[PDB]
Design a protein around this ligand. Structure first.
Ligand SMILES: Cc1ccc(C(=O)Nc2cccc(C(F)(F)F)c2)cc1Nc1nc(-c2cccnc2)nc2nn(C)cc12
Length: 262
C-alpha cells in the first residue's frame, strides 16, 4: 500500500462509524496530480499496537486487488496519527440505496450491465482465491458512470448467505455465488430487501422448504433462472463466476432474449 503524506489529505465530513473509528469523505491533493475526492477509514486515539495492525491488515488485503469492478485503494497514512485507509469516492454511493432512490429509472440492459460488472469483480476475486463472505448490494459502490465496484464495509447477513455457510461456516467462492444471486434479485427489484420483512428464522425456514425468491417485476425470465442456478442447495452445482459472466454476456449479445418475462 502506497504511503500518503497526511499534508495531502483533508477530511470534509464524517459519513459513518467503523469498528475502530470513523468513515469520512475527504480530499486528496498530491503534488503532481489533480485533487480527487476520497473515502477515508480512520483509526485514532489510544488503540493498542495490535488494533493498529488489524486495522492496517485490511489495506494489505485490498492492495492486492486491481480490477475495474473492485474498489481501488488509494493508499494509507501510517507515519502520523490518525492512521487512515483511503479509497476512491463513488458519486452514487451504495448500490441498494442508489437503486431505491432511482426505482424503475434504469432499463433492463443497464441493470444487466451493473450485474455483469459485479460478476466480473467477483470472478477476479475468486480467481485469486479471495472469498468475500459478505457480498450484498449494500457492499457495492456505484460511480457516476454506473460502474459497480465490489467493496466490503464490515458489519447478521443471514439472508445473503448460502445455507452451508450459515450452518457450518463453509465459506467458499460457491457460497459467494449464492450471495451474488441475492445481489441479482436486489438489483432487479431496485433495492428491495431480500425476503422482505421475513425474520432470519423465516428465511432459513423458507430455504429449507426449497422456496426461492420470485422474479421481480419486469425481470427477464432468463435472469431469474440464473438466480435460481446460483441458489442451488448443492454448492457444487452452482455456476462459477466465469460461467455467470458468460451467461450475462450472452444476454447482452442477444437482447431479445431479455424481453421474455413472466
Ligand atoms: C475507506 C475504505 C476502506 C476499505 C474499503 C473496503 O471496501 N475494503 C475491503 C476490504 C476487504 C475486501 C474488499 C473487496 F474485496 F474489495 F471487497 C474491500 C472501502 C473503503 N471505502 C469506503 N467508501 C465508502 C463510500 C461511501 C459513499 C461513496 N463512496 C465511498 N464508504 C465506506 N464505508 N466503509 C466502511 C468504507 C467505505
Amino acid at each position: 500500500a502506497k504511503e500518503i503524506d497526511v499534508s495531502y489529505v483533508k477530511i470534509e465530513e464524517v459519513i459513518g462509524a467503523g469498528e475502530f473509528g470513523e468513515v469520512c469523505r475527504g480530499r486528496l491533493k498530491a503534488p503532481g496530480k489533480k485533487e480527487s475526492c476520497v473515502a477515508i477509514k480512520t483509526l485514532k486515539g489510544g488503540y493498542t499496537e495490535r488494533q493498529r495492525r488489524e486495522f492496517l491488515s485490511e489495506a494489505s488485503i485490498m492492495g492486492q486487488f486491481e480490477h475495474p469492478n473492485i474498489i481501488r485503494l488509494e493508499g494509507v497514512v501510517t507515519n502520523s496519527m490518525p492512521v487512515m485507509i483511503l479509497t476512491e469516492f463513488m458519486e452514487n454511493g451504495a448500490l441498494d440505496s442508489f437503486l431505491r432512490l432511482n426505482d424503475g429509472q434504469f432499463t433492463v440492459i443497464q441493470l444487466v450491465g451493473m450485474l455483469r460488472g459485479i460478476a466480473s469483480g467477483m470472478r477476479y476475486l475468486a480467481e485469486m482465491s479471495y472469498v468475500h463472505r459478505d457480498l450484498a448490494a449494500r457492499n457495492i459502490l456505484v460511480n457516476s458512470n454506473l460502474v459497480c465496484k465490489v467493496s466490503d464495509f464490515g458489519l447478521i447477513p443471514i439472508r445473503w448467505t448460502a445455507p452451508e455457510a450459515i450452518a457450518f461456516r463453509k465459506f467458499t467462492s460457491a457460497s459467494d455465488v449464492w450471495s451474488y444471486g441475492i445481489v441479482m434479485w436486489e438489483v432487479m427489484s431496485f433495492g428491495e430487501r431480500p425476503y422482505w420483512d421475513m425474520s432470519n428464522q423465516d428465511v432459513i425456514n423458507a430455504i429449507e422448504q426449497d422456496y426461492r425468491l420470485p422474479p421481480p417485476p419486469d425481470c427477464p425470465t432468463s435472469l431469474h433462472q440464473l438466480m435460481l442456478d446460483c441458489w442451488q442447495k448443492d454448492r457444487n452445482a452452482r455456476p462459477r463466476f466465469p460461467q455467470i459472466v458468460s451467461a450475462l454476456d450472452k444476454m447482452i449479445r442477444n437482447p431479445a432474449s431479455l424481453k421474455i418475462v413472466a
